[PDB]
């Protein structure tokens, strides 16, 4: 409701990464808490495109 | 997953499809049949298809006509 948009760009962020990291840990069927650095070297380097 | 009718085909009963987000035939064959493929998991995660049917080819005029006749047929 505040409507804070940098806030609003960091849930989004936060929500979204959690969400793609569950949905890839279970089509994976590997336990989410293991399954950072990949993601994190894909969005570290994220280029123009990505 | 899906059957539908496009424009792509003209003497062909029928033809298939990738997804938009996936390997293609030949990516996928050459990914798979290359060492130290890895399949684990990778491999149980892609290649996605759908399906085709031109409505020109009289085969697929006569299969509907029969078809419309018997709903639980053998051949």
């Known amino acids: 409701v505040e409507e804070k948009c940098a806030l609003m760009e960091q849930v989004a962020h936060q929500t979204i990464v959690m969400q793609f990291i569950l949905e890839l840990a279970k089509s994976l069927k590997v336990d989410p808490r293991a399954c950072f650095r990949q993601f994190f070297t894909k969005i570290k380097t994220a280029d123009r495109q990505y | ?75």
Do not use: F
């Open chain 2, 1 to 75: 997953e899906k059957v539908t009718i496009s424009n792509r085909l003209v003497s062909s009963p029928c033809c298939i499809v990738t997804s938009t987000y996936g390997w293609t035939a030949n990516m996928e064959r050459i990914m798979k049949a290359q060492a130290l493929r890895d399949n684990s998991t990778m491999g149980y995660m892609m290649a996605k298809k759908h399906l085709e049917i031109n409505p020109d080819h009289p085969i697929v005029e006569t299969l509907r006509q029969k078809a419309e006749a018997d709903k639980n047929d053998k051949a």
